[PDB]
Subunit: 209 residues, 4 copies
């Protein structure tokens, strides 16, 4: 790659054809809809939880991705390491908005389940979610005695699902929910970054922080 690559104004102005939306446009699109159920992926959607995953990786499997199948990792990740996870502003805004509408708030995660979890609590506390709006984190997947994320969406009648990963958007699509994309921060340790907008879905502006 050249030492001085230069640029040109076609590249400076170039836009990908993304359907960008704001929080205000989403609220507007819902105006006069009665209280409903909506859901959020957790990691890189409402929490920059990379610190915990990064400590996990270094502590348990510095040379592979095996820490993610290790129950001792998950016990720590789910029971306190979220105290170093940084709440996303986009999620504060969306959650306050959905609380303002009287909506029911669900969090649906692909994290491995553990005996106990204080994530539900970290989320109710960090985002000021009233007990009445709040629901215990749902641990979805394809282990025996789990339902998948789409089954949970169908089961909870979740109408809007917010998330950063392709599987978040497809899961919403599968059950006819509205999948709305959030940008993953470029300093996340989960890489490569997804291509936000890859299914033609709404992507929220400035949602990396």
């Amino acid at each position: 790659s050249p030492l001085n690559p230069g640029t040109n104004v076609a590249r400076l102005a170039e836009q990908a054809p993304i359907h960008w939306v704001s929080v205000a446009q989403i609220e507007n699109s819902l105006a006069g809809r009665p209280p409903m159920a909506v859901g959020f992926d957790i990691d890189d959607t409402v929490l920059f939880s990379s610190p915990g995953f990064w400590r996990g990786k270094k502590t348990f499997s510095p040379e592979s991705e095996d820490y993610l199948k290790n129950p001792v990792f998950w016990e720590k990740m789910n029971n306190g390491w979220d105290e170093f996870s940084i709440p996303k502003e986009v999620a504060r805004q969306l959650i306050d908005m959905h609380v303002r509408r009287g909506d029911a708030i669900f969090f649906v995660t692909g994290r491995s389940p553990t005996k106990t979890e204080t994530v539900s609590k970290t989320l109710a506390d960090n985002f000021h979610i009233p007990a009445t709006n709040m629901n215990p984190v749902i641990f979805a997947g394809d282990k025996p005695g789990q339902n998948t994320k789409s089954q949970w969406l169908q089961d909870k009648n979740i109408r809007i699902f917010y998330g950063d990963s392709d599987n978040d958007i497809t899961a919403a699509r599968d059950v006819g929910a509205r999948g709305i994309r959030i940008l993953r921060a470029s300093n996340s340790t989960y890489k490569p970054l997804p291509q936000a907008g890859a299914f033609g879905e709404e992507v929220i502006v400035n949602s990396e922080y």
Copy 2:
């Protein structure tokens, strides 16, 4: 304004909430729709015609907007000065696409009408539009003996209207047609630049050239 204003990454990554689309996405949204009528504003939508407007302003009214109510200007502008107008690439793609589909193509302009006009021919020539798809330019407005752009869109059953200006999109909105925005180039002499996406309409990416 500071000599060294500096910047930051929230500002470098910031996106306005615009519904961007590509030509390809628009062609796909129309897949299996039979032939229909579509229309295009001219100036800064399919032709960068500032050269003639600029020449006009300097020649007839260096000091005002008066040239635009001068019939001697309009006669030069519509009978040759578009030989200096530069066709937009976005318009070559859109028009080739609509030709492919077998659509009827209309140009609806706010330019003042004149005895004769060679703009229709400049457009059929520059854009390789088959006579069968092509239609003479419609000069629309609020002069006696004119109909408005909206009435013309209703009259021709134009389903899609492309334009750079707010009135292009609202004229489409008036009659229930799909208004699609094209970016006016920053070197156009028509200023200020419109706020593309001001009505929540689709805006075509990279459509300034």
Copy 3:
């Protein structure tokens, strides 16, 4: 290319490594330097002259670059077609700044020379350049009876050369003058766009209009 390519925040925030400068920064870098000679390339540096080039190409050689070796083209281009050329705002700022400082202003072009030329006058008129600061356009090249752009910069003791093309900056580099890049507009008909900053030179921000 995918219908929905999507994007990500590493790509939204990505910057090429360019030395951007403002007109204000350049004026400040010259603070308390006495009057000097500076020069400007014409086409896409101070005038968006694509209208005349475009008209030329269609009229004389729809199918080649031959129009550019046609004396009948050059006679039209240099004796009036610049009435359709659109002055760049960056050039109004730079030239007003250099006039302020009392600098001698040169235009050095690669256009083919002709019997007469009204480009010098178009530039003195459009840019309000005082006759005392102004100099007739220098037509430079490798034709017999010509000197090259570099020799002209050496000959006039031009300390700063502004231009959009690689040869503008390298001609400056050849003779030890400060080469400063201006962005060619994306609707110019001269393609491909140069890679501004390809030599580690300064590039003026927003200089496409």
Copy 4:
């Protein structure tokens, strides 16, 4: 603020006049310079340490900035909470480059000093810094028995100082070192973001991650 603010291509292409540089351009600028001393701010320069500061703040002073004057906070921040701090790629690249040159690597921080600190170790381990290149973190400030960051730069003959905050760049400027800016991540909890480039200094591209 409007629900549909729109945009225009002047804004889409608009650039701040920053002197952006790459890691390769910096190495190139140093080529054939003998081994030297160079230094790095820590927080948001080589480590996204916001997780630790964010846990600190919530644990010790949820309603003020007093945690930053609390020694119990600093003992935890400096003795393990960096295990959740995320190394910046830009810092891996710069440190490997400066290690390749045989340079001496210093880290100079404004963190309050504590009895012990394992930050030096976290940094040597995460960035693979050979013992011979590595130096214990220097805790600078204006407490009694400290030297300021500029005094330390002068004292260690540090020739290049990398950092995200204005005080990093001014400290380098004060002693005639080369201050090079790194972009603070927009998900940092330390806000507002600095204006990278505010002294006309080099800013490294894409240095938020």
